[PDB]
Amino acid sequence: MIRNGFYIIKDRFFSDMSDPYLKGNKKQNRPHYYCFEDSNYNGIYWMIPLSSRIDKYKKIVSKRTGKGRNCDIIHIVKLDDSHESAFLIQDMFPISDKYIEREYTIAGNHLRLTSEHAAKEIEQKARKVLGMLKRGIKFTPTQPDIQKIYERLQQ
Amino acid sequence: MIRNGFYIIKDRFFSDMSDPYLKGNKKQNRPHYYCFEDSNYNGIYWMIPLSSRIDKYKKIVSKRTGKGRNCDIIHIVKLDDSHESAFLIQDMFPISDKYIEREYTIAGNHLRLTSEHAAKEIEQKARKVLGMLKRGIKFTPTQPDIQKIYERLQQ
RNA sequence: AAGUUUACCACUGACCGAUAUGUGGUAUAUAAAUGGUCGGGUUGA
RNA sequence: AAGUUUACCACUGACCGAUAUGUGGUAUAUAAAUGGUCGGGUUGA
Ligand SMILES: [Ca+2]
Ligand SMILES: [Ca+2]
Ligand SMILES: [Ca+2]
Ligand SMILES: [Ca+2]
Ligand SMILES: [Ca+2]
Ligand SMILES: [Ca+2]
Ligand SMILES: [Ca+2]
Ligand SMILES: [Ca+2]
Ligand SMILES: [Ca+2]
Ligand SMILES: [Ca+2]
Ligand SMILES: [Ca+2]
């Protein structure tokens, strides 16, 4: 994987981890964003699932925004396919190389977040969210057990 | 000289160049800012004179700002002595090492523009102003002849 | 797909302090990314 | 101290064009610094 690219993840990942709170892979159709490599173990990569349910995710953003705060758990931006996507940073999770199926493409090119300023903002939000998750913060009552996944990946 | 430092220039410079439009050096009491070294000749340095006449220079800035444009010829910023200074980028000029008298000081330390973001903005404004001056632009009818000075410095 | 609880840790430039509505980090604090503001301070335009 | 006339050159990301109210550069354009918008285009949530 290359940083800021979008990818499809093998269903095998989801059946191996068996976590009912990960965003469903929709049979290898949900694009996932590769945010950054883990600092502590090489070969573990942090991914963020996307959703196109903008009406739903805008309301969640506006919960914070309407109180004068940034939303770190969701970030909505127009991708290079010219449509808006929600990055569910809240639901980010770790993965290893063997679980990656392929590049997510647009007309046979690799879709990726080419706008560096958007990538940078997303990366910051993700570091913050991951920091908070590691310290036991729960943004929803249905939060994936990324600690369990992370330990399983430690091969 | 070190980039972003303030300096006093020898009166000898001003009597040698005899340019009535350079900002008067007030008998070696006008601080001057060292912006950047000349690209074409080492040992030639571009300087910017300062003025504390903020009321006057604010009006000149607002001529452009009031039409929605940036002012590049004048930039006003609070220095580390906690007072506002006008950088008369319009009146910038070249100099060589032998015309520098000494560091401009605050309580025996070297006054300099430590706020990098301000230094960067000023450097950009200066590159633009110098570019325009080299192409014959005249911001005032009383503009120093920096070409003549620049040639004299070449020796 | 559904699901909707923002924590903690440091940092904020003449120099000496302080500080968040600013900066970044994620168990680390000689890091990273900021450089505003307030008090002291101050030859010089 | 007084003095108060903003030019030109390129650049604006799946890909192909275009563009300044955006980016930077100063005689250079395989540079630098930006990455919005419009038109085309588009398996997948
Ligand atoms: Ca794009
Ligand atoms: Ca379109
Ligand atoms: Ca300062
Ligand atoms: Ca003060
Ligand atoms: Ca510091
Ligand atoms: Ca301090
Ligand atoms: Ca403190
Ligand atoms: Ca450091
Ligand atoms: Ca480019
Ligand atoms: Ca283009
Ligand atoms: Ca063009």
The answer to whether B1 and B7 have CB atoms below 8 angstroms apart is yes
Cα distances from A27 to residues A7, A10, A138, A155, B48, in angstroms, run 13, 8, 27, 25, 65
Cα distances from B12 to residues A120, B18, B41, B89, B100, in angstroms, run 52, 10, 22, 22, 10
Which fold, A2-155?
Answer: Thiol Ester Dehydrase; Chain A (3.10.129)
- Tokens 């452009």 correspond to what residue? B64
Cα–Cα distance measured from residue B44 to residue B62, given in angstroms and rounded to the nearest whole number: 32
What's the resolution in A? 2.2
B94 CB neighbour count, 10 Å cutoff:
22
The answer to whether A97 and A123 have CB atoms below 8 angstroms apart is no
Cα–Cα distance measured from residue B152 to residue B81, given in angstroms and rounded to the nearest whole number: 35
Cα–Cα distance measured from residue A4 to residue A116, given in angstroms and rounded to the nearest whole number: 9
The answer to whether B26 and B9 have CB atoms below 8 angstroms apart is no
Task: Kindly determine whether the C-beta of residue B53 is less than 7 Å away from any atom of nucleic acid strand D.
Answer: yes
In angstroms, the CA of A51 and the C1' of D44 are apart by 12
- Class of residue B68 by CB neighbours under 10 A (exposed 0-12, middle 13-18, buried 19+): exposed
User: Residues for chain A: how many in total?
Assistant: 155
Per-residue DSSP letters for A39-73? SSSTT-EEEEEEE--HHHHHHHHHHHHTTT----S
Give the ligand with the smallest distance to the CA of B115: 3
The residues spanned by each domain of chain B are 2-155
Instruction: Compute chain A's Rg from CA coordinates.
Output: 15
- Class of residue A77 by CB neighbours under 10 A (exposed 0-12, middle 13-18, buried 19+): middle
Q: Which nucleotides of chain C are near protein (any atom < 7 Å from a CB)?
A: 1-8, 13-15, 24-27, 34-37, 40-45
